[PDB]
Amino acid sequence: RPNRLIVDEAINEDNSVVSLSQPKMDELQLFRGDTVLLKGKKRREAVCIVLSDDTCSDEKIRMNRVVRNNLRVRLGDVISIQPCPDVKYGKRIHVLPIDDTVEGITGNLFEVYLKPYFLEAYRPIRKGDIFLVRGGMRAVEFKVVETDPSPYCIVAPDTVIHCEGEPIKREDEEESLNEVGYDDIGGCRKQLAQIKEMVELPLRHPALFKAIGVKPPRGILLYGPPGTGKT
Amino acid sequence: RPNRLIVDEAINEDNSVVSLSQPKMDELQLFRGDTVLLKGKKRREAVCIVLSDDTCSDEKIRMNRVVRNNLRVRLGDVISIQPCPDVKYGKRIHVLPIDDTVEGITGNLFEVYLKPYFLEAYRPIRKGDIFLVRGGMRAVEFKVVETDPSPYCIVAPDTVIHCEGEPIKREDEEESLNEVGYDDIGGCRKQLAQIKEMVELPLRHPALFKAIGVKPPRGILLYGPPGTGKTLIARAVANETGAFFFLINGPEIMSKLAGESESNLRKAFEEAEKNAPAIIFIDELDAIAPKREKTHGEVERRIVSQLLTLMDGLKQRAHVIVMAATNRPNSIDPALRRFGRFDREVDIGIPDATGRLEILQIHTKNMKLADDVDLEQVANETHGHVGADLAALCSEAALQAIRKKMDLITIDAEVMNSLAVTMDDFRWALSQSNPSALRETVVEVPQVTWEDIGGLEDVKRELQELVQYPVEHPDKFLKFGMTPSKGVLFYGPPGCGKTLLAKAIANECQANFISIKGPELLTMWFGESEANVREIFDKARQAAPCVLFFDELDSIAKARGGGDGGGAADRVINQILTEMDGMSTKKNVFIIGATNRPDIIDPAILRPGRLDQLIYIPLPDEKSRVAILKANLRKSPVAKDVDLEFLAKMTNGFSGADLTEICQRACKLAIRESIESEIRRERERQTNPSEDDPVPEIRRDHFEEAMRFARRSVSDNDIRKYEMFAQTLQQSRGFGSFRFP
């Protein structure tokens, strides 16, 4: 099924843009825009803007950690990619910051964070999604609790944003974006790739490794001067 | 009784083939491929196919582990063999897999496992037989529930197999095929044979040993670098002899509280006593009983003393053999190497190319491999691998193949059987593999042969008389009053094949070859670690018959000035002399020294009882040069139009190193031309997107160009010096006119 694409790390840092390989969007009938509704592994649907890049493999879809989290998928998982041209310019979207990422923050969060975000770019939004905004040398994750053309919309320049205190407690299923990820690591791309090749198959497919008769790696020894982020 | 035959290890891995010796094959009118019935130890009959081989001994029958298991017999047991021409081509066969061998696999086993089996080959089948099928890199054993012409049947290609799933839980008295055996061990054929001859008789015939009353081997120390499967060797020996196997892990014992370690050791020895005959394997003995200086604590010394006490009390214990593993003999307390303790010693060491090939076959046995794979090449390239390194390499190749296959896809056995590892995967693993024994001393029979040098017939004769005759005809040396010469000294221009000659003589005698290069002697000299010389000889003695080669004995003399004002004596060469004097001629350890500066060699080494013979290895002659060129180009594709004889004739005065340089330069030119032409072709395709190898072989032009860089590293002055040395040695031989009256 062409709609099935394997998740992979993203190059572009936009938390609403997914990238595909050149022989794919045409095959899937998509363009540099063409908001697409990807399907998650927990009945989670995320609408994001499509893009392209040469380095991306034919069967790989590059997505950032935010989309991965709100889709409840991890690297190497397979997601359904299907065009979503039936997108409406929602007028009022009610969002809410998560309490865990706003402690000690005061001021108009919308102006501080949601204003530079959701502006100068027709970002797609899906109800119940979590989107991260980096500003003021902080990172705040906002949960979209309601959109007027439910469950998905596009934030137009005239679109209205709603929020009134009452920070929402993160649910158990959601994983904090501050949790470490491959995007939080730099300077060891080669070594990180080596470790990934070592451990992904044993960890991502434990039942296969138990049923199969190959020897998994047991002890990996990362060395180097302290402060290189081995932990 | 002719029917009685002694079970023996099999060379062909087929569950329905048993090999017989030619005389006994004809004695019992056993025809090739004829069905034969074997009677087990406990009324366990099995039908197999007779094969013929020369290596098989008359009174022994070569049989694999599957047949042995369904016969309930072990190596060295006696079974009755009878021809069974009265075979029936049974149609309906009911078989069922054992659960523990299919724990994880899914899909129709028959379509993926039993379909290749029983196909294109008539496999005799008997009810109750458990037979192993190796596929999908997972070996699965099936138990024959029943057959139509019970109990004996043949699975003809038109037969029918009925399977109802429901894997059978294995019952008692049936040892699992995954249990280690001699077929699961590779790279230690000599050491495994030594351990077998050590322990089989005490273990297989405990009463015959206690009643008879001789000293059994109570302590065996298998030392060698980690990863050589020493625990595997011990477990296989225990399983094949039927002896109870108790494993003591050094770290596990030392991980317990004080008192708990002593209790655990005592309980292990008591359990071994209870289940005698038994083997107690102490893995990582150095963990328990390191050198007395490395055991600071008092509890550690108490544990070592407790182990010594248990080893000494073994005498009261009956038919209990204790095996221990260590990296080196010096890693453990010397008190453990006394008599009544780990006095027997075996050196597993690094596997050789043949050993590495055996290991690769063992590990790549269930693996489905592509046709392009040649494990011989991998074994050749896997220098410095110990066997755990080879297992890791095979696993890495399998994992890379799994990645390359499943990237586009509780497992499909059909997929795994379809999955195949290619030489590309193995070469990638080789690149990504880090051998654990790269700097371990190499002790192996060299693959060099006299043809690689193809010259110096007199030198061949001298080397034969000095190495081959002592080991091949000890009776002749005893008959006359001659003691074999301890060693010889090669001297001559650099790169003239002294190492080649030493390796060739070692190969001819099938003796181990140890090379001690000049950098090693200089490392001992600079570090003042001349004591290591002992180890070297200890290695050679452990590998006798062995050729101990010192590539540059004059390296230290050169390092001090061809001088520094002192005498020719130095610490390292002094230790070499000391070890040579303390070398028993009964051991067939032959010392060969090589030098380009015979003048500066310490005279003490050129004495009777030492490297007394001096052999001049001159620059290769025309025939030797042709042989050297052929040997260098053996691995290279060379166009037939090149006349290596003409090249040898025109390259007079060249050392073997010079000819190797010419050949390598020709290969360089050929490779450069190949790469340039490939770049040209791909560029032409890019510009003209609208094939054959331009240079499949090294042509004449390549050699002609390489000869323009040809060098003569040995000047006529150096040849003059060496010839003057030889003439000085030969002119003193002025008593040839002597004749009796």
Side-chain angles (χ1 to χ4, degrees), chain A residues 4 6 197 201 205 207-215, chain B residues 104 137-138 391 395 399 402-403 406-407 409-411 428:
Chain A
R4 256 187 51 174
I6 295 172
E197 99 195 350
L201 253 164
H205 310 132
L208 173 139
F209 254 77
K210 191 58 63 184
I212 205 189
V214 79
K215 260 147 70 127
Chain B
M137 45 158 281
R138 176 190 254 291
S395 293
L399 288 181
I402 288 161
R403 285 194 275 273
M406 92 93 61
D407 48 341
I409 82 182
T410 83
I411 51 166
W428 176 86

Side-chain angles (χ1 to χ4, degrees), chain B residues 347-365:
Chain B
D347 191 358
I348 309 310
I350 317 307
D352 79 292
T354 319
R356 290 190 306 253
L357 171 59
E358 295 164 48
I359 295 159
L360 290 164
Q361 276 152 218
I362 288 157
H363 292 311
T364 73
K365 238 173 205 154

